Design a protein around this ligand. Structure first.
Ligand SMILES: *[C@@H]1O[C@H](CO)[C@@H](O[C@@H]2O[C@H](CO)[C@@H](O)[C@H](O)[C@H]2NC(C)=O)[C@H](O)[C@H]1NC(C)=O
Ligand code: TRP
Ligand code: TRP
Ligand code: NAG
Ligand code: NAG
Ligand code: NAG
Ligand code: NAG
Ligand code: CA
Ligand code: CA
Ligand code: CA
Ligand code: CA
Lengths: 523, 142, 49
């Protein structure tokens, strides 16, 4: 089909997949002198390959276990998006070839398998782009990372479900954190895509609700040129606001953090969104003098029992179905498979790449839960007693001719318990509700790398105003310090003094003016 | 946007999802359609512009909704789809240019699919600042 | 311009009325800068604007 590189395996039911194997594509500005050629992906993403392995492991465990889906095999056709909308659209067009050729009837292999369900993309923009085409045929799409609030609009994204909570709770949690540490002068940075803008707007509204003044609001992108990034760094420099709120992903934030480190801008506290609170692209020790002591967010860790061994068992020659294994081997051992020559028997446990050296599984558990949710919808179809099913007159879908819309209908009314004991249900908005873990960016005393240690949680189930819990004794501000940094716009006025309006400046900033002769102010 | 929207239907209770019916009627949309038709016909009539060649057209209705526009765009790029995906009727017309949709979300959705084949899209009504990012909307004009 | 379709005067859409010459702007807790009070100047002080 379109993408020549893929990881596919035949089966009775085919499940699509869209994982970022690369962080982006080559910056090739085509002048269209000749025929345009397919762009190439540049920076390998080991996190994406681990997510792909998570999906493959879940499918293999489904096939092996006879309790869940007996006498039925699950296949997959997993592709690469490279964090790019065009590549994911090509992969999706590969997914919907059968349905679209049926709808259009161009009269031609007549044997292309039909994709029952698709595990959604990572980025919010790419997920929306894929959903706009997948929901056309009502093929369910269970995303694992896409957390945009725009994707809860079931009017537009009919067949979209996700295993990760949206950014409403994340923005509420960041506002709660800001008001918990007694700050009113902050700054906002957002990625110019469908993920950063809605979250930053929600946080701005909530901060204005809580009387928090935002000094600056700037948008960044992975393809930002020198002038725009220089302007952003200048507005960060001129600002007196210490704490800075960032709603961005790793690749979208890398250029800005590189420029900040090059200018050695220090003294800022970064409130990281979950996207880059654990991004190895920014969580590098050479940046710790700038990004140290960054308070971020992380989802609840899952427990996949045999996942570690399956990750360790990847072999370029023993993985016939996985076509991404060769590039993974080449990029993890810096060798060429026919620049040294790969021996074909090296040990993966020797290299330190974000594929096996993980503390917790957060989005890998989301992928596992997505695959299990699709499998459990299929099983619910399998064990549907006639006369009492979700269909008309209590009828049940035929296993030999399951259609995507039936799987989506069963997914809407799904209620199952995962291996951790929690109940997995998708709301009418199609999303899921989960707790948040608040982490801080420290430095390893024995390794020197960035270490994320938990400083508190954010219980979504609690009542408003009591969700946030912070254990400040475990926090090291700016990576090393202990005192809570000062981030008022202006110093507090003491007794006997009155607030003075500063023209053209937000209400969080004022000048202290002493009370007149006949007047007093106690507090 | 000949129609302003579509009817309401959800909760596919064993009902295989069918095409939704557009509800209202926009006479401005039909005007715009006739504007494009008239321009094409006068270009064909004029011998000065494009000698010895006739400009055809193939126009659909978006109903101000993403799904209808996506179906129209899929019908647009079927020939380039066959060329690229290597997936026939052997008579699919070669659409070389698409006059863009009206809505900004509709234009974004159509452009995310047209930019794969680098088909130019000269919209007339979409005016969001998000469509100026040429890193993503490679073949979108305004 | 017919303002509301019938009128001819520019509507007033400020949070608080302009303070007089003898008064000065005073903040209100929880309100933006466009909303203020009209605290009178103390004795010995003046304001012309
Ligand atoms: C930064 O400004 C905030 C106000 O925006 C200060 O928070 C106030 O703290 C006092 C006592 O700690 C409370 O009585 C007030 O109610 C708080 N303000 C609000 C609006 O609730 C905070 O103390 C300031 N930080 C510093 C270091 O001065
Ligand atoms: N736009 C993506 C950002 C992202 C990239 N990698 C991630 C990993 C985990 C969570 C989020 C991300 C999202 O909201 O999901
Ligand atoms: N009703 C508007 C539609 C429109 C104009 N500009 C837009 C920009 C984005 C989306 C829609 C529009 C019109 O007829 O002109
Ligand atoms: C920021 O400060 C620099 C140096 O003082 C100044 O040149 C610039 O105009 C200021 N504002 C912005 C938006 O850069
Ligand atoms: C950056 O600034 C910090 C501030 O203490 C300093 O320790 C460090 O040496 C500086 N590095 C460079 C490269 O200027
Ligand atoms: C899901 O099933 C469990 C099993 O007892 C039940 O307790 C729970 O209420 C169910 N949830 C919904 C939303 O039906
Ligand atoms: C979320 O946090 C609360 C408070 O710590 C806890 O009671 C609850 O069990 C957590 N949620 C899950 C799914 O464990
Ligand atoms: Ca089974
Ligand atoms: Ca100002
Ligand atoms: Ca002519
Ligand atoms: Ca207020």
């Amino acid at each position: 089909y379109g993408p020549d590189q893929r990881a596919q395996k035949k089966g009775d039911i085919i499940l699509g997949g869209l994982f970022p194997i690369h962080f982006g594509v080559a910056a090739k500005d085509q002048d269209l002198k000749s025929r345009p050629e397919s762009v190439e992906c540049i920076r390998y993403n080991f996190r994406g390959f681990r997510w792909l392995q998570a999906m493959i492991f879940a499918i293999e465990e489904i096939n092996s276990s006879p309790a869940l889906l007996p006498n039925l095999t699950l296949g997959y056709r997993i592709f690469d998006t490279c964090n790019t909308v065009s590549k994911a659209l090509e992969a999706t067009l590969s997914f919907v070839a059968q349905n679209k050729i049926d709808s259009l009837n161009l009269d031609c292999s007549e044997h292309i398998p039909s994709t029952i369900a698709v595990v959604g993309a990572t980025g919010s923009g790419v997920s929306t782009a894929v959903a706009n085409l997948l929901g056309l045929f009502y093929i369910p799409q269970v995303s694992y990372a896409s957390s945009s609030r725009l994707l809860s609009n079931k009017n537009q994204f009919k067949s979209f479900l996700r295993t990760i909570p949206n950014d409403e709770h994340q923005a509420t949690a960041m506002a709660d954190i800001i008001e918990y540490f007694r700050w009113n002068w902050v700054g906002t940075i957002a990625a110019d895509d469908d993920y950063g803008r809605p979250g930053i707007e929600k946080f701005r509204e909530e901060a204005e609700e809580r009387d928090i003044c935002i000094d600056f609001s700037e948008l960044i992108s992975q393809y930002s040129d020198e002038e725009e990034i220089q302007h952003v760094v200048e507005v960060i420099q001129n600002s007196t606001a210490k704490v800075i709120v960032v709603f961005s992903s790793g690749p979208d934030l890398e250029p800005l953090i590189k420029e900040i480190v090059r200018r050695n801008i220090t003294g800022k506290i970064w409130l990281a969104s979950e996207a880059w609170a654990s991004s190895s692209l920014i969580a590098m020790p050479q940046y710790f003098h700038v990004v140290g002591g960054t308070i971020g967010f992380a989802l609840k860790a899952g427990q996949i029992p045999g996942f570690r061994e399956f990750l360790k068992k990847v072999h370029p020659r023993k993985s016939v179905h996985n076509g991404f294994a060769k590039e993974f081997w080449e990029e993890t051992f810096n060798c060429h498979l026919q620049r040294p020559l790969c021996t074909g028997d090296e040990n993966i446990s020797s290299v330190e790449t974000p594929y096996i050296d993980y503390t917790h599984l957060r989005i890998s558990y989301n992928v596992y839960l997505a695959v299990y949710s699709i499998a459990h919808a299929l099983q619910d179809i399998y064990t549907c007693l006639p006369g009492r099913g979700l269909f008309t007159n209590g009828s049940c879908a035929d296993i030999k001719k399951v259609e995507a819309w039936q799987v989506l209908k069963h997914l809407r009314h799904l209620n199952f318990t995962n291996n951790m004991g929690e109940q997995v249900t998708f709301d009418e908005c199609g999303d899921l509700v989960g707790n948040y873990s608040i982490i801080n960016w420290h430095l390893s005393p024995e390794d020197g790398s960035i270490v994320f240690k938990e400083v508190g949680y954010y219980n979504v189930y609690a009542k408003k105003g009591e969700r946030l819990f912070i254990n400040e004794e475990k926090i090291l501000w700016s990576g090393f310090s202990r005192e809570v940094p000062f981030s008022n716009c202006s110093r507090d006025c003491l007794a006997g003094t009155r607030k003075g309006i500063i023209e053209g400046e937000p209400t969080c900033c004022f000048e202290c003016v002493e009370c007149p002769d006949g007047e007093y102010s106690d507090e």
